[PDB]
Ligand binder design. Structure first.
Ligand SMILES: C[S@@+](CC[C@H](N)C(=O)[O-])C[C@H]1O[C@@H](n2cnc3c(N)ncnc32)[C@H](O)[C@@H]1O
Ligand SMILES: C[S@@+](CC[C@H](N)C(=O)[O-])C[C@H]1O[C@@H](n2cnc3c(N)ncnc32)[C@H](O)[C@@H]1O
Lengths: 218, 218
């Protein structure tokens, strides 16, 4: 089994990559902007199943991790939650989030790398982690997921939505990302102290695309 | 088994790394300048076994691949060969090679990345490839070794000297290098169309250090 070292360069390259990504919906999606509508439709449906009623997540506060300009906040979180906070390492995306989300400007915008971020203690009903876990190493993802657990209000949930490789991991040096497989991802979730409440595979995506999964964790 | 993509970024990072490496012997060795003397002593001994006499390599021309400033050219090749040529992607190291090798200046200095280099046809008695194969991907190393084969004069040899992992490969993102193991390296050599004439393990190195091997190929 292969050993990969150079964490500092792994993170430094993701910053150089996102420095040239446009602060637009198309830049957030990559080469798959036509996939934003079915991505959003599936998230809204999956989310609703775990919110409202006794023992389910509340609707006061949500956290959008690796938010970018706030694509998930706009179409998924802001319609459901009274207040939504955004966390992203890129100041550029957080500034554009102000125009993209059409807010007065003007606290809800956190500029931190997730591996250096502690979600405020018991603040959130829902913590959303979409298309960003792949940018964290196995060690940093495990520690971040355990910290997200303490950021949860009573009956709060973490929603992890990402690419899940068929079998075997895929490392991409261009954007410094890892496409984990189901075995590796479930291990990290279990080790962080989280349990899977539910899971759904993203439908409506072309057969060529790597499978996309949704997990409800607590 | 893991899939690694992003060749362009893999090569782009090695250039950024060598841009900050000093054009000195200490910079060529890394954090192991005290290891240059036993490295040189072992190379001189290994080389002599495959040069001179019927059916062995001649002594007219040698090529130093990933030469740097010409550490191997200075202490190994220039005492044996009538003329020695250097190939390195870094112009900085090739310019310093002029002062380091104490030459008039002032054709013998080739500024090319090995994966974009074709050793001149049947020009060399010996082609030296030391502490650079790790910077080539498996595909580019295989193709380069097959091209080195055509750069060889009759009875010429390729001397490959590098770090060989115990079992399993080690990828280092900081300098964009791979420490191949014996199984992977021997496969690439066989696939390039080369056969092993001889092999020796580098002695006199601390127990902590990754094993260093020498191969005589043709
Ligand atoms: C593919 S975009 C996804 C944006 C958003 N989650 C969506 O679904 O539209 C990845 C985002 O993660 C952010 N990011 C990448 N690595 C990060 C890290 N280690 N810490 C924080 N943010 C990071 C990037 O700045 C970018 O906004
Ligand atoms: C560790 S230094 C070794 C220098 C020399 N072989 C020695 O033993 O002193 C690695 C050298 O390979 C060069 N190099 C790295 N990747 C290269 C590539 N793809 N093509 C050509 N030269 C490369 C660097 O510029 C540097 O001079």
């Amino acid at each position: 089994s292969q050993v990969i070292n150079g964490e500092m360069q792994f993170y430094a390259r993701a910053k150089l990559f996102y420095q040239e990504v446009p602060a637009t919906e198309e830049g957030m999606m990559g080469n798959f902007i036509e996939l934003s509508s079915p991505d959003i439709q599936a998230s809204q449906k999956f989310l609703r199943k775990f919110v409202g009623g006794p023992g389910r997540a509340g609707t006061d506060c949500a956290l959008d991790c690796g938010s970018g300009i706030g694509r998930v906040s706009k179409h998924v979180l802001l319609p459901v939650f009274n207040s939504v906070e955004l966390v992203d390492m890129m100041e550029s995306f957080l500034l554009e989030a102000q125009n993209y989300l059409q807010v007065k400007g003007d606290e809800s915008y956190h500029c931190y790398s997730l591996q250096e971020f502690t979600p405020p203690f018991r603040r959130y009903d829902v913590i959303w982690i979409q298309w960003v876990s792949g940018h964290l190493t196995d060690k940093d993802l495990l520690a971040f997921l355990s910290r997200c657990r303490d950021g949860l209000k009573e009956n709060g949930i973490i929603i992890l939505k990402d690419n899940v490789a068929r079998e075997g991991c895929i490392l991409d040096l261009s954007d410094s990302s890892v496409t984990r497989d189901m075995d590796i991802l479930r291990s990290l979730i279990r080790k962080s102290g989280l349990v899977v409440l539910g899971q759904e595979k993203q439908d409506g995506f072309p057969e060529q695309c790597i499978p996309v999964w949704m997990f409800a964790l607590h």
